[PDB]
Amino acid sequence: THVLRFGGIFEYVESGPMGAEELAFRFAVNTINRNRTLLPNTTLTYDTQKINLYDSFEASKKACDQLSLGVAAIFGPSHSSSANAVQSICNALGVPHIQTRWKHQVSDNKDSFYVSLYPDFSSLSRAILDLVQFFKWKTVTVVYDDSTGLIRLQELIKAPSRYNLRLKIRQLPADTKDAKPLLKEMKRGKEFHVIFDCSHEMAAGILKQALAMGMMTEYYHYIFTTLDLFALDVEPYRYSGVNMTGFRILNTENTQVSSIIEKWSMERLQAPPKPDSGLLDGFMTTDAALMYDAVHVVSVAVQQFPQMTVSSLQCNRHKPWRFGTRFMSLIKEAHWEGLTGRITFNKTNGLRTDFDLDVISLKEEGLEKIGTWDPASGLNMTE
């Protein structure tokens, strides 16, 4: 009988229930504890702490508390300022750091003990660039929201120096959802081919404002960078004649994965979606799908390593954990068929640049898979 303790550092909300990632972290730990073939005779427990996500000092205190109590991994603070602080703690004290969201990896950072399960925007900007070639675009307009979106789509911005695109980079307004002065300039500029770098909460907001202005016609085509395009109530836009392409790594066409999504709406039951926020009703985001996967990919590594004993490391007397070097190598060699497809890592750095997308577009009936993407193959679009 073993007691492994996966750490976690999640968002602190005062009014609603626990977040989507903290639910999926608790739902995953309960899944391996019930299921018997994966990790027999062990009992995964958890040590979830809650932070502000914008406080690198508070994230570093909770990371040293989890190392003092003793963890075998830390499943990310999930924000760029807080994740870089906890990554360097986990690098110095041996213990792995599991990331499920994208952040800017600075080029001269010699950190080994981290893996990210979010699909890398080195690969995702090539998938978007393959679509604008397939659709024969020449007047692309990238619309992002925050200044880090330039780093995300940098291979798309450098594309007119190797092809015949003509980019017109624009930015959403600072914090307000008043995208109407942006969309007036896009409508007057005759820009019919738009790539949005947004989240699905902000994709839904500007799609209501593109309806009310001029822009949900059969002349406009919208590629979406977000992987949660399948979580939009697209009922006002089905008959609109529009073309709305995108991607989806959440492999919802398996019977096994769709079983878990149907289980997900049960225990989540609280926090209903407010009506003028036209996301769909019951779904896993790809944010929570990668946190459900991250517990399983580390679980592949602990099944291949049974003699693990959790130690109580100390930050101001920082010494590496005894099995931190081998167990990190088992996480970077782990293969898993999770909610988000195949999960293999990039041996050099530790990212997911090898993954399987599903190109989805908006048809009259609904929002349907019209192709596939694969870094080896490319676009296999059976449209």
Ligand X SMILES: *[C@@H]1O[C@H](CO)[C@@H](O)[C@H](O)[C@H]1NC(C)=O
Ligand Y SMILES: *[C@@H]1O[C@H](CO)[C@@H](O[C@@H]2O[C@H](CO)[C@@H](O[C@@H]3O[C@H](CO)[C@@H](O)[C@H](O)[C@@H]3O)[C@H](O)[C@H]2NC(C)=O)[C@H](O)[C@H]1NC(C)=O
Q: Compute the half-sphere exposure of residue 4: CA atoms within 13 Å on the CB side of its CA.
A: 24
| Rg of the Cα atoms in the chain | 21
The yes or no reply on residue 332 touching ligand Y (CB under 6 A) is: no
Sequence letter at residue 288: A
Which residue number, 88 or 243, has a Cβ lying nearer to ligand X?
243
Question: Taking contact as CB under 6 A, which single stretch among the options 111-119, 154-162, 218-226, 304-312 is the one that binds ligand X?
Answer: 218-226
**Residue 35: which of ligand X, its own copies, ligand Y, none does it interact with, CB under 5 to 8 A by kind?**
ligand Y
- Three-class HEC string of 176-210: CCCCHHHHHHHHHCCCCEEEEECCHHHHHHHHHHH
- How many residues make contact with ligand X (CB under 6 A)? 9
**Token pair of 162 as six digits:** 């190797």
From 54, 135, 148, 312, residue interacting with ligand X (rule: CB under 6 A):
135
In the complex, minimum distance from the CB of residue 378 to ligand X, in angstroms, rounded to a whole number: 8
In the complex, minimum distance from the CB of residue 186 to ligand X, in angstroms, rounded to a whole number: 14
The yes or no reply on residue 3 touching ligand Y (CB under 6 A) is: no
Instruction: Enumerate residues 103-122 that contact ligand Y by CB under 6 A.
Output: 122
From 111, 201, 233, 354, residue interacting with ligand Y (rule: CB under 6 A):
354
Contact residues toward its own copies (CB under 8 A) are: 54-58, 60-61, 80-81, 84-85, 87-89, 91-92, 104, 106-110, 141, 146-148, 150-151, 154, 157-158, 160-161, 166-171, 174-175, 180, 185, 187, 189, 211-214, 217-218, 236-237, 239-241, 315-316, 318
| The CA-based dihedral angle spanning residues 91, 95, 98, 104, taken in that order and rounded to the nearest 10 degrees | -10
Which H helix or E strand runs over 328? Answer: helix 324-331
Which residue number, 260 or 271, has a Cβ lying nearer to ligand Y?
260
In the complex, minimum distance from the CB of residue 341 to its own copies, in angstroms, rounded to a whole number: 26
How buried is 31 (Cβ within 10 angstroms: 0-12 exposed, 13-18 middle, 19+ buried)? Answer: middle
Question: Taking contact as CB under 6 A, which single stretch among the options 37-45, 59-67, 216-224, 268-276 is the one that binds ligand X?
Answer: 216-224
Which residue number, 49 or 84, has a Cβ lying nearer to its own copies?
84
Query: What is the C-alpha end-to-end distance of the chain, expressed in Å?
Result: 52
Q: Look-up: residue for tokens 């409508």?
A: 187
* Of 241, 234, 181, residue with least CA distance to 209: 181
| The CA-based dihedral angle spanning residues 183, 184, 185, 187, taken in that order and rounded to the nearest 10 degrees | 80
| The CA-based dihedral angle spanning residues 214, 218, 219, 224, taken in that order and rounded to the nearest 10 degrees | 90
> Cα(381)–Cα(383) distance, rounded to whole angstroms?
5
From 14, 108, 218, 364, residue interacting with ligand X (rule: CB under 6 A):
218
In the complex, minimum distance from the CB of residue 135 to ligand X, in angstroms, rounded to a whole number: 5
How buried is 52 (Cβ within 10 angstroms: 0-12 exposed, 13-18 middle, 19+ buried)? Answer: middle
The yes or no reply on residue 131 touching ligand X (CB under 6 A) is: no
> One symbol per residue from 243 to 272: x for binding ligand X (CB under 6 A), - otherwise; what is it?
x-----------------------------
Query: Using CB under 6 A as the criterion, which residues of the chain lie in contact with ligand X when the complex forms?
Result: 135, 218-221, 243, 377, 380, 382
